[PDB]
Write a protein that binds this ligand. Structure first.
Ligand code: FAD
Ligand code: FAD
Ligand code: XE
Ligand code: XE
Ligand code: XE
Ligand code: XE
Ligand code: XE
Ligand code: XE
Lengths: 615, 615
């Protein structure tokens, strides 16, 4: 991370200086806001944490609960989700506290032993090279804490307005500004029944399964009935079952159970299959029968419930009627994210993960449009992108409901999907057609940017290239240099740089607000195949050693080389970069690859951004 | 980390529940305390952070400054120091904020260019396999913050009493208790001149170079005059010198300069050699002349000073007159740690690192003696251990003041020393003679426990074996199993376990306080050469799957296997364990190896602890 850009600043650098552009939090919900987020769940808090980085935008997030939760229902944190946490700079903390899932063991009835289970299998939870982070388990409330702190420590000093239940949302397609009117009811005993009204430019319903925002704009969850029902109990118990600290799938004559080891090394979660006139004792009794001959002595039960939901999904995620928007469609004003527009069966294994990816998709778009850096039409891509991949995910898990090798295929694909790295957007306003995909085979257009190790040239530090992509709303341009680029500036990477800084028609010059840092909209990172010791910084374009901030201090983290010390760690090899041609990999603020273009196709680059950005 | 041992606990698990055994902090310094620490510098705060883990001990730390510092003079954090930070569970945070030192480049005058420098060399800062953590640079005040938070979040809820200057310390060798009387003068304007008195059992002077505690007990820094003088400036400047983000040693016709890249990617520290009627401007001017033809445009200077000190050291670190203590010597009551008893020349490169190792050495000893778990004689080893290695360090850096390969030898050894991993205690009350060193060649008796990767059997998680050693005052017993131990319990590791739990004469039974967790004094960790998948937990002694806490929850982190997935990562190979015999590696609470014993030499194990522990 970088700090002290404008002078020494004491204390933890992750606490940002309060921005004057942002009015202090008030007891009463403001009358007018840019964005009103409804619901402090994974989705709501994810969006709020993203918008909190832009103090020029007025964001208000409401939640009907009277305060932060301390113990939540979701606990699975996918690899891709961890990558996003890294973007919010708190993945590190999650890794130290969460319970990693390295293996998953399977238990079935012992063939020779009557009514007793035995271990039948074991698989590595995350296939090699799938992600730089592992799949982990951590109490949902803790993820909330991190987002709540990020929000609080942001320049926005953003915090939620609790004990507020959104009663209704209306859009005045005739209003000149703040067309959305939200009616809220205060739920705390001290204000019980009090009605609040908020004028918003955009409203985001992240209010869960029984979302009022969804029903307010007439959308509806379409799907099937609750396939199964699960008894879920978090327990502090003593057992001799040897795989208790692993993620375990148990099938037995007396029922099926799923074991999820919890953070701390002691707590354990049990998913007991069923199908409320059902108790903990019954669940425990069932788990005991299943675990037999292994003994389960439950000492304490911090939490337990009943997880039962069908897979449903809205046809659209916003208030725009057209199934497929076009340049003449009304613009969206209200969006739905998370369970409010799509719920997945427990067996799907998505948990809260996929839900947060909706918010990460919408986040930067809202900010760009509000800042008038992008045409409002951009907002249409939120629904077309997130609705489609959700439906495709459901279609897949619809058949996962079970050749022997066709199953190992289903099993493998399911892993990539639960890890959250299977999302692949189809060609669109933002996504290219992949005609130059061979330039960087390892960076599939439309999928998340698969990070790989590189070596920073300024100080020889080993780093994950994809970690340059932080949740700061910036587009990234990873320019992998052709073999001779460093030696021949007439073309290649250096020529691209020359174009990006000096050609008035370049997207960098056209769309970067006057007076802002040269990398405030487009974060360019250059990667040369040459050993870091062979890259002379002093001979590189200023665009690659950009001054910034009030003191013109130099950013020395824009230039990289491959890891040439350790065998098989060269990113040019790992990601299939065309060595002779090089490659420009354009990445969205949500870490998704938009394009893989030839370094020399400057016109294509300009044209791309001209299609949705505003000069 | 492990938590929820006695029930679900919300919030950050690193915040410990307040212990009732510890009285709340008071505005006025308590009248009587177990330990009085003088000075909130690296040493003082390190000791306080260690003692804060024992709420049954009354610890008071005073500092004359009126509050925590925000910008300190020291900034180099050695590998070994990082290992200790890992023991205090905040090494992670330091790694994310600090500026890593991967390479060190050397610059000298260009032979063909008049009065201009050119790069002459480059070396990897930390030789391969020296430590699992790198050498890093971070503002001293931040290390203080971490210690201050650890202290605050401990069961002790420990915080410093500021604006107190210790005027005098006296020992009443006739007192029945609290033989040490400390006289303090309040320095804050509101209490200016007020005299405070404290009765303490032990006093630790961590009050720096001009320490009053040292002079109070008649000790004195013996050494040579200030070899050199250095102008030190932390600056926010713009330069085109290409190696500014590296640690750089520059020798030129116009002077010598040392570049230390600071946390944040922008701040930089410059050590300008000299030898106060000297200004920043002069330093800057000198640095510019040195950096020529490279330009240095200083924009801001958060801090600057003049580092000038000779290498001096006390003959003893406590108030006991005998040069070498024996069973009939008076017991120590006052100890000196850090610069108060030993200062190293800037070129030595020790910074504040070695200083904190004194406190980490004394910490657990004081606690054990106060808890009557160890004979007070143990306290003698503090001085004999820390004084000797400090002097030996000085003797070495005395000659480092410069065959060509004899220099590369001096250069290499100097690196291990600056990394803080060269400390090697000679045989003593605590340190063995190494007659069975071949059992575990990679764990040199008397040196720090060189961690290596292993695989936890309960959940297959990759971990650093040495990270089992936390700053919790516990001795560790790393039992590396013989090849057939798992298959033949009659002897080997399993037999050792049988002895440790069932033989009344075992150190574990003899010295673990009645009613405490079976691993509260001796932290046993077993390592089998077999693949983790081959270790059946359910068939292991209870000592290896120990119940603990109020609920008898099982600790599943006592059993390990090697990393057999990745080539050349098997700890039995990496650390030279005798495969046929196995090995017992006994480690002190400060992470230093005390013994390497045969698994079967139970008598030797007992005898060792009987020599200083109290039943
Ligand atoms: C009983 C139960 C048990 C579950 N068990 C599991 C499990 O074991 N494993 C698992 O992976 N998932 C489980 N889930 C699902 C998991 O909780 C969700 O997938 C996850 O919470 C979805 O995140 P989200 O942001 O979309 O919305 P949610 O987490 O559903 O949050 C919506 C938020 O909006 C607020 N809100 C709603 N309406 C309004 C309104 N009108 N005004 C103001 N605020 C409002 C709510 O109070 C809530 O905080 C369970 C769900 C339930 C209901
Ligand atoms: C001007 C200066 C510049 C330096 N520059 C560098 C540098 O560039 N690089 C580097 O590596 N090292 C530098 N050092 C050395 C570095 O600061 C020390 O090595 C490090 O602080 C030693 O840690 P310590 O815990 O032993 O004691 P110290 O950090 O010296 O702290 C002693 C503490 O005790 C307190 N104290 C002292 N006497 C009393 C009393 N009677 N009553 C109450 N409180 C008292 C002090 O106020 C202080 O907080 C510098 C030192 C000085 C003085
Ligand atoms: Xe499930
Ligand atoms: Xe750009
Ligand atoms: Xe386009
Ligand atoms: Xe120095
Ligand atoms: Xe022991
Ligand atoms: Xe001994």
């Amino acid at each position: 991370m970088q700090f002290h850009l404008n002078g020494f600043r004491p204390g933890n650098p992750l606490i940002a200086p309060a921005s004057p552009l942002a009015p202090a939090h008030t007891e009463a919900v403001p009358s007018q806001v840019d964005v009103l987020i409804v619901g402090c769940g994974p989705a709501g808090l994810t969006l709020a944490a993203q918008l909190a980085a832009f103090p020029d935008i007025r964001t208000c997030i409401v939640e009907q609960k009277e305060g932060p939760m301390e113990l939540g229902q979701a606990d699975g944190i996918a690899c891709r989700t961890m990558e996003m946490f890294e973007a919010f700079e708190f993945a590190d903390s999650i890794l130290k506290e969460a319970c990693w899932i390295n293996d998953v063991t399977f238990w079935k009835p012992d063939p020779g032993q009557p009514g007793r289970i035995a271990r039948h299998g074991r698989v590595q939870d995350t296939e090699d090279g799938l992600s730089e982070f592992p799949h982990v388990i951590l109490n949902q409330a803790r993820v909330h804490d991190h987002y709540l702190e990020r929000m609080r420590n942001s320049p926005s000093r953003l915090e939620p307005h609790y004990a507020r239940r959104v009663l209704d949302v209306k859009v005045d397609h005739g209003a000149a500004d703040y067309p959305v009117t939200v009616t809220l009811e205060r739920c705390d005993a001290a204000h019980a029944g009090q009605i609040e009204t908020v004028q918003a430019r955009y409203v985001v319903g992240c209010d869960g399964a029984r979302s009022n925002v969804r029903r307010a704009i007439g959308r509806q969850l379409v799907g099937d009935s609750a396939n199964q029902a699960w008894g879920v109990m978090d327990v502090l118990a003593v057992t001799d079952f040897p795989d208790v600290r692993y993620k375990v799938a148990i099938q037995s004559e007396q029922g099926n159970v799923l074991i999820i080891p919890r953070e701390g090394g002691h707590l354990v979660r049990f998913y007991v299959e069923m199908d409320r006139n059902i108790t903990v004792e019954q669940l425990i009794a069932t788990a005991q029968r299943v675990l037999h001959p292994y003994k389960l002595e439950v000492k304490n039960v911090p939490w337990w419930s009943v997880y039962e939901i069908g897979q449903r999904i809205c046809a659209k995620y916003d208030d725009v009627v057209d199934a497929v928007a076009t340049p003449d469609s009304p613009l969206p004003r209200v969006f739905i994210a998370g369970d409010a527009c799509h719920t997945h069966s427990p067996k799907a294994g998505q948990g809260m993960n996929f839900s947060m990816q909706d918010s990460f998709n919408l986040g930067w778009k809202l900010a760009a449009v509000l800042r008038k850096q992008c045409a409002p039409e951009l907002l249409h891509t939120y629904s077309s992108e997130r609705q489609v991949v959700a439906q495709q995910l459901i279609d897949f898990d619809r058949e996962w409901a079970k050749d022997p090798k066709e199953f190992q295929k289903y099993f493998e694909q399911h892993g990539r999907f639960t890890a959250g790295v299977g999302t692949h957007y189809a060609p669109s306003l933002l996504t290219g057609q992949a005609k130059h995909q061979a330039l960087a085979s390892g960076f599939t257009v439309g999928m998340r940017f698969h990070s790989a190790p590189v070596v920073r040239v300024c100080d020889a530090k080993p780093v994950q290239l994809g970690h340059c992509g932080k949740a700061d709303g910036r587009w990234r341009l990873y320019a992998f240099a052709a073999q001779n680029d460093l030696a021949q500036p007439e073309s290649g990477l250096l020529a691209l740089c020359r174009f990006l800084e000096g050609d008035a028609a370049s997207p960098l010059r056209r769309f970067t607000p006057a007076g802002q840092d040269i990398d405030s909209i487009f974060d360019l990172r250059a990667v040369f195949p040459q050993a870091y010791t062979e890259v002379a910084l002093e001979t590189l374009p200023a665009l690659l050693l950009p001054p910034k901030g009030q003191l013109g201090m130099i950013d020395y983290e824009k230039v990289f080389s491959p890891d040439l010390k350790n065998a098989g760690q060269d990113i040019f090899e790992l990601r299939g970069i065309d060595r002779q041609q090089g490659a420009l990999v354009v990445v969205r603020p949500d870490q998704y690859v938009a394009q893989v273009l030839p370094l020399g196709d400057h016109a294509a680059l300009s044209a791309y951004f001209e299609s949705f950005m505003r000069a």
